Amino acid sequence: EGINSRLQLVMKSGKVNLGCKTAIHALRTGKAKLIIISNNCPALRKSEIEYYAMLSKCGVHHYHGDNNELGTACGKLFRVSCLAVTDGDSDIIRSV
RNA sequence: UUUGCUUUUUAACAGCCACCCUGGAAUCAGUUUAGCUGGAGAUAGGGUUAGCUGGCUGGUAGAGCACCUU
């Protein structure tokens, strides 16, 4: 809930790639600063992302409260399982 | 009364005519008679596949049918 403040700060300044496929696309690229995955996300899907994150090495990643939460945390009426923070005023990536 | 009625048909069989890729959606968009669908990837563009008792040729005019003359 410190992150819930700091996340919406990033989207104004920087950019974020929301959804599973665009997140994994960034990891192959090695261009994703961190991966945020929803708790409600399918169990198998997260495993693939956090394997990819180990290979990308600066995948790092971090868990939330909930799937439907994570969209409205962004400021989106649709819902999101996974983010990928591409690069913001707030250093989300250093502390977390 | 350029009129009213009857005939003008084609068999089984055989060949041919939901899902993926690109992509990344809020000023939300697509859509049914009705509702539903969509970052667990929508519209759109290009494909793949399912099908009926669909279309074309073969079967098949030699047959069947309606008439006419020695």
Residues A88 and A4: beta-carbon distance below 8 Å: no
- Chain B positions within 7 A of any protein Cβ atom are 24-26, 28, 38-41
Distance, angstroms, CA A39 to C1' B8? 75
Alpha carbon distance A1, A5 (integer Å): 7
Phi and psi angles of residue A84, each rounded to the nearest 5 degrees, phi first: -155, 110
Question: By what technique were these coordinates determined?
Answer: cryo-EM
The Cα A69–Cα A30 span in angstroms is 27
Distant-in-sequence, close-in-space partners of A73: CB < 8 Å, separation ≥ 6 = A4, A7, A8, A64
Amino acid (one-letter) located at A88:
G
